[PDB]
């Protein structure tokens, strides 16, 4: 998250921290995700496509720090890793960038809701906030584009939704953005998602309800003029999600 503010998991208790274990045993952060039911996390396919083996991953819930345990957290293996059949990628753009992880602990259990671990609601179909609406993004991704390290503390920021028609303009992303994607940015381009924020939540308040509007997917740079963040538009994948949640 470029700019924004530090936070803790109470302020985004559906946020899932996804890591990958290496051959040799080191563990590294991959991507964010969101808890949509006790046994399911939703994320982005591009996070997993090069290493698509479920036994490679570890999922934490209730975690506010990247490399240190948070009191109350829970740790899960990945019982199933479901990537979208029609995934593709450009040089920049990722299509159908959505993934489901079914989570199960060493004891065989799913998430247990607590002050630090909650589900987030999915949107009603084809129902998105109007352009210019302020929504929030959360993650452990870089704080500057040139950084080498990820922040140790979770961050969040606010960005505003951009119309299809505006995001479509050559000097933005032209044809790269489809109707199954949502653009969002800061009016001064000063805050954004970045590397390592992928898979995480874009949350808007919809009919007085906090709703998973988007999933962090792609962008040219970060916090770059005329280059918004691009999000998978969750309201256009409800049959896919409904069906795969077994």
């Amino acid at each position: 998250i470029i700019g924004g503010e530090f936070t803790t998991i109470e302020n985004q208790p559906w946020f899932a921290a996804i890591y990958r274990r290496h051959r040799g045993g080191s563990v590294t952060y991959v991507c964010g995700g969101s808890l949509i039911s006790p046994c399911w996390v939703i994320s982005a396919t591009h996070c997993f496509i090069d290493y698509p083996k479920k036994e490679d991953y570890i999922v934490y819930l209730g975690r506010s720090r990247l490399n240190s345990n948070t009191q109350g957290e829970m740790k899960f293996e990945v019982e199933n890793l479901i990537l979208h059949k029609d995934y593709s990628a450009d040089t920049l753009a990722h299509h159908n960038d959505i993934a489901l992880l079914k989570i199960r602990s060493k004891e065989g259990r799913c998430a247990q809701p607590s002050r630090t671990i909650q589900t987030i609601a999915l949107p009603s179909m084809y129902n998105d906030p109007q352009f210019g609406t302020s929504c929030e993004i959360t993650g452990f991704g870089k704080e500057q584009s040139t950084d080498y390290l990820y922040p140790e503390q979770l961050k969040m920021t606010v960005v505003k939704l951009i119309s299809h028609r505006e995001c479509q303009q050559p000097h933005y992303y032209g044809s790269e953005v489809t109707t199954k994607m949502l653009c969002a940015a800061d009016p001064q381009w000063k805050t954004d998602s970045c590397q390592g924020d992928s898979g995480g939540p874009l949350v808007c308040s919809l009919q007085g309800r906090m709703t998973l509007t988007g999933i962090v997917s792609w962008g040219r740079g970060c916090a770059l003029k005329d280059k918004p963040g691009v999000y998978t538009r969750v309201s256009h994948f409800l049959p896919w999600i409904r069906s795969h949640t077994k």
Binding site: R20, V30, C31, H46, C47, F48, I49, D50, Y51, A89, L92, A93, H94, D97, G141, S145, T146, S193, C194, Q195, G196, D197, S198, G199, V216, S217, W218, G219, R220, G221, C222, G229
Partner: peptide
């Protein structure tokens, strides 16, 4: 590789 869409990719 320095940005979003290539997280966890072998070529990065």
């Amino acid at each position: 590789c320095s940005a979003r869409g290539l997280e966890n990719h072998a070529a990065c």
